[PDB]
């Protein structure tokens, strides 16, 4: 029931963000929500090439680092890498089949594209700091610590994808498949999308930001300056990505775009709150392990932990959630020098 | 069964291009086939921004056009728009879910992205040459002549997509869904995939080039210089795209990748041939609509048809197919200037 070109003539201004008629013509002269067109414009204007950044000196810097510090840096890098591997593909595979307005369709493809550039930049960095990149790459997949911090990300995307598949194939209803009963509900599928988006929002809003702090800590010490420039370029893109997810959720919860979504949003509030807290926790936990055999110069488990509570608070309010943590001022205001945005 | 992040640590250098384990880590330090990495690098180096292109004068030229030239012009542009609309999402929705090597996964995404840019350029052109783009865009969807020419593009993709879903949900075998027997053969999916690519190859390699010739006819008349600028940037992308499909197809036939794929290519050669013959003819049939109100000096049905055979033959030989048409030299050697 999915089509690469819906032959029905339709007003693309009146379609909902998701689950309406698949987009046929790709036009950009008009939009139901211009924020999406603005996002495409800004992301294109931000286009950059990793190779164009010199990382010549990070190698010796990396190598002179104290062992515990090498670990901190590389684990963090490994984490960023995983996240972007997932982000390069997932929004395209997960959202495209359910988008009904073109500006959003294209924003998603542009956003996903920008994530591949991020992946490209990681290879660039790794290549220039270790002897055998394969050692780093191979550890991303099975690193117990990583799948542990990242746990649940692929699963939200994977379930939505499968549900989407059943929906498109079988349509809404109570069906049977090889002797088993399989129920398909548009409502359950909207829930899944909603929680999946909320989760990607955390991913962009919190997970990455925590990593930015771990990377910029080195920059503050004039260390890994190649990596730093890349991270800076990456953080500028994330702000945009963050903006898209926030608007999507806000338009969804606000009931303007899809009433049922507004409803749904309300019913899983507590569910979302918990999801958020869970993510803030994983990050804390990661932090607790990355700084066990030694803390770094200007960052430690406790500072990082405060940061996570700090930014989590801001992100959650930005999406109408209650604050889970004690309100406090930024505990590492020096980071603002790197977050050009 | 599909996964956004496969947990098995796997040698990505040994997976097949398609149907292997979904790519987990995105690494570009090595590649099974470097031609894909090379394509990503070139496309990136070719990044361009449409709006930046000056089309301030295209409206003047365009308005001053004889009614039929306008029609020729717009009908053509509307077709390009339809194709880029499909090519912006298609590769991502149809292929992404079946790729098993990172360099190919990223190439597909860059490629698709490159197409959204092609689409943004058309809006840029449109919005600047007509008073209400809605007429154009609305027309793209309903224009029977246009759909007739594009017939079978969205269908291959849609078919492949659907079988893919079954495959991912049910896995291979004969199943019972809602009391009906549904068969899921991977070999059969592989054929859908293979023919889909062959069709995209025809789309990138022939359908777009004929469209370029039409666009460029105007440039040669010193008219529509903004469009022309854009068409050249686009042609430059299209050359990388078909290089990409030719390579996929040729690598598959070689037997160097999934052996089952090479048997399929051999087994399906007539289908391959028949689809190019059918695409060529659609491009030929379009002339009747294109030239409804009259032709232009140097651009007519005949020229058009001769160009179609000329180029189709070049393409088919590029992927090892027999040539259906009578050999000939380029009927429009002047297009070379723009194509480079
Ligand atoms: Fe990223
Ligand atoms: Fe991002
Ligand atoms: Fe294109
Ligand atoms: Fe193309
Ligand atoms: Hg999601
Ligand atoms: Hg998700
Ligand atoms: Hg941190
Ligand atoms: Hg750190
Ligand atoms: Hg929720
Ligand atoms: Hg949430
Ligand atoms: Hg295809
Ligand atoms: Hg296709
Ligand atoms: Hg032509
Ligand atoms: Hg066949
Ligand atoms: Hg063939
Ligand atoms: Hg001919």
Swiss-Prot record, chain A:
The active site is at 122. This is Ribonucleoside-diphosphate reductase 1 subunit beta. Its cofactor is Fe cation. E.coli produces two separate class I enzymes. This one is the functional enzyme during growth. One of its GO terms (cellular component) is ribonucleoside-diphosphate reductase complex. The keyword Oxidoreductase applies. Fe cation 2 binds at residues 115, 204, 238, 241.
């Amino acid at each position: 029931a999915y089509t690469t070109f819906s032959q029905t003539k339709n007003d693309q201004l009146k379609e909902p963000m998701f689950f309406g008629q698949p987009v046929n013509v790709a036009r950009y002269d008009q939009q139901k929500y211009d924020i999406f067109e603005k996002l495409i414009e800004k992301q294109l204007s931000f286009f950059w090439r990793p190779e164009e950044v010199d990382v010549s000196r990070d190698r010796i810097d990396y190598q002179a680092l104290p062992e515990h510090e090498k670990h901190i840096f590389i684990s963090n890098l490994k984490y960023q890498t995983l996240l972007d591997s997932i982000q390069g593909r997932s929004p395209n595979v997960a959202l495209l089949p359910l988008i009904s307005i073109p500006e959003l369709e294209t924003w998603v493809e542009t956003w996903a594209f920008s994530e591949t550039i991020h992946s490209r930049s990681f290879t660039h960095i790794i290549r220039n700091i270790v002897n055998d990149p394969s050692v780093v790459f191979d550890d991303i997949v099975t690193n117990e610590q990583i799948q542990k911090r990242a746990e649940g990300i692929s699963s939200y995307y994977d379930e939505l994808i499968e549900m989407t598949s059943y929906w498109h194939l079988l349509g809404e209803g109570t069906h049977t498949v090889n002797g088993k009963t399989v129920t398909v509900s548009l409502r359950e599928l909207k829930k899944k999308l909603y929680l999946c988006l909320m989760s990607v929002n955390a991913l962009e809003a919190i997970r990455f930001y925590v990593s930015f702090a771990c990377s910029f800590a080195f920059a503050e010490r004039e260390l890994m300056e190649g990596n730093a420039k890349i991270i800076r370029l990456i953080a500028r893109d994330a702000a945009l990505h963050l903006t898209g997810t926030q608007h999507m959720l806000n338009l969804l919860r606000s009931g303007a775009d899809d009433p049922e979504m507004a409803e749904i949003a309300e019913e899983c509030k507590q569910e979302c709150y918990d999801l958020f807290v869970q993510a803030a926790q994983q990050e804390k936990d990661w932090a607790d392990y990355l700084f066990r055999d030694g803390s770094m110069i200007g960052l430690n488990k406790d500072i990082l932990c405060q940061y996570v509570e700090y930014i989590t608070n801001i992100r959650m309010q930005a999406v109408g959630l209650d604050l889970p943590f004690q309100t406090r001022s930024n505990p590492i205001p020096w980071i603002n020098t790197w977050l050009v945005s």
